[PDB]
Amino acid sequence: TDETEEDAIFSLLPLLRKRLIEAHAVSIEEAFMTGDGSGKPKGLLTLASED
């Protein structure tokens, strides 16, 4: 919101953007590790188990 930016001494935007990107990377790597098949890529461990 455009009021918490003024309602503080230091900025809070770069933290927001960096959190967005790093959350995205964490989720993709976790899904590649052990994602199921329901709307998400089948994880390596799931492939190994089902083979």
């Binding site: 003024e6 309602d7 503080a8």
Partner: protein
């Protein structure tokens, strides 16, 4: 009207419509802007 021989179409076709806009008296404001102002840059 329709008193003479010739006439006009409707009673709204001899009226002058003015776009002048008038407003009544409004209360004055006193306390709103007589105190000194203190800028703030935080909560």
């Amino acid at each position: 009207n329709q008193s003479s021989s010739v006439e006009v179409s409707s009673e709204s076709y001899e009226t002058i419509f003015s776009q002048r806009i008038i407003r009544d008296l409004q209360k004055e404001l006193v306390v709103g802007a007589l105190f000194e102002e203190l800028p703030m840059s935080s909560k």
